[PDB]
Design a protein around this ligand. Sequence first.
Ligand SMILES: [Mn+2]
Ligand SMILES: [Mn+2]
Ligand SMILES: [Mn+2]
Ligand SMILES: [Mn+2]
Ligand SMILES: [Mn+2]
Lengths: 191, 190
Amino acid sequence: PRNISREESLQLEGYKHACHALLHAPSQAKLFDRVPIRRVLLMMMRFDGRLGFPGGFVDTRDISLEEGLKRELEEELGPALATVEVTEDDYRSSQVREHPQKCVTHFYIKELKLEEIERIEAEAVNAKDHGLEVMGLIRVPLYTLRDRVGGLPAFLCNNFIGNSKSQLLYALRSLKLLREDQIQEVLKASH
Amino acid sequence: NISREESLQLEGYKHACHALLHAPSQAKLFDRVPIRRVLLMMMRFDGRLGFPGGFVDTRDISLEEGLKRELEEELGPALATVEVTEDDYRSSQVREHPQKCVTHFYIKELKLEEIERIEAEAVNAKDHGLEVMGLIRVPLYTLRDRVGGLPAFLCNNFIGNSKSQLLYALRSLKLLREDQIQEVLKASHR
Ligand SMILES: [Mn+2]
Ligand SMILES: [Mn+2]
Ligand SMILES: [Mn+2]
Ligand SMILES: [Mn+2]
Ligand SMILES: [Mn+2]
């Protein structure tokens, strides 16, 4: 999994493209009324039994990266996304590979209002892809519990698709949620 | 393992109840792979997968009344009308080095629409976004690559003897035979 710029990857020939987004919102809620949730981050159980971000393959000879993302989000997350514009401003990074297959993955990150996230969750059951490609929506625990494992560390022990584990860790950094040491720490507690 | 009447009068041990709710399904994945059955589990606040339910004080209302409560709390209001009776009981396990606990497992077949209504109102549960970070369905099939679906699913991080219990259910409901179950774990483990 290699880093590459948007413009450079879009000039490539014979590559498959995918788009995936992290939809997130701040929250004041405290787990057990003591542990702050801080922010809601959405991921999913996929048909293949792995955790992933919503999104999928985009044909760039046909539609833009944003256009492809939009369609796949509405299919996977549901009608509530018709009110949700993920634009070029939301674009973050692009990784490329040639093995097993020549594949470029794009990652977006988009902040929403809490009630937006909540509407998305409420309406996900009505998605075309519910109970098929998408087996359920999930929130990422951002805290470590007193036992030093429960929460994010333990969650990172789940089974992730492609580079999704790495994209999330990037977002944790990008959104200033965890310091590099906190991130390294979480990864150790995870074993 | 353990036993029900042997378990319910221990001494000091803490008691928990969890349930697998499931329904038959005609749906097919890529218009190819049958779903067969919809089985509910969840992502917990601690980052692990588990069944809904929780602790129930043995002296404070029956094992079923503990469960039904923890169900409405975690899965939501829809459950008030779910009837998780004594006949829905299935097993108990004893542990010690952890907290000394008795886990009671319950399997109850519902109608699909009922599962659908449970997933749809789950976002209204007292514990949505607190104890319960989201419901999921258990993929029962195995993909052409012979890893995706259930075997990949068993590599996720499960609480307690949650995995154990699920394997039990799959045999309990004649969903997979013992060798098929073994095939799945051998694919899973690697
Ligand atoms: Mn997808
Ligand atoms: Mn898709
Ligand atoms: Mn409880
Ligand atoms: Mn509970
Ligand atoms: Mn619980």
